[PDB]
Amino acid sequence: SADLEDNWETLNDNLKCIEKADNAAQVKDCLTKMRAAALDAQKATPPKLEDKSPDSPEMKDFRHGFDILVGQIDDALKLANEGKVKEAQAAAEQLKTTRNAYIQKYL
């Protein structure tokens, strides 16, 4: 099993994976694992919001950050499927921006 902290580390390890990958098959596995961990983290309650109602604006913001992240991952997967390996890898910068601005502030 995995908790939010575990899934966060999986997400960040596979963000590094995307940046260091050498071919389409590799980036696809990195992006797949990031997407799986993102969906699992999205269902958690982050430490700063444990006193909030589950549908509070803050929890909606937390979850929307992952919806953005998952959309960016899917966009990068499409590029990787098209053989645009370098452009797929470039999504790492924007994934970090989403991660930092939406989710990190709740940990």
Numbering used by the authors: 0 to 106
Wording from the paper:
We applied our method on two proteins which were previously determined to high resolution and frequently used as fusion partners for GPCR crystallization, cytochrome b562 (BRIL) and Flavodoxin, and verified our prediction by solving the crystal structures of the wild type (WT) proteins and mutants.
The continued disulfide omitted electron densities of the side chains suggested that the disulfide bonds are successfully formed in all crystallized mutants, which are T9C-A36C, A20C-Q25C, V16C-A29C, and K27C-A79C in BRIL and N14C-C93, A43C-L74C, and C102-R125C in Flavodoxin, respectively. Compared to WT BRIL, three mutants (T9C-A36C, V16C-A29C, and K27C-A79C) show relatively better or similar diffraction resolution, lower conformational entropy (ΔS) and comparable B-factor. These disulfide bonds are located near the middle of helices I and II (T9C-A36C and V16C-A29C) or between helices II and III (K27C-A79C), thus directly strengthened the linkage between these helices. For BRIL proteins, the simulation B-factors are consistent with the experimental values.
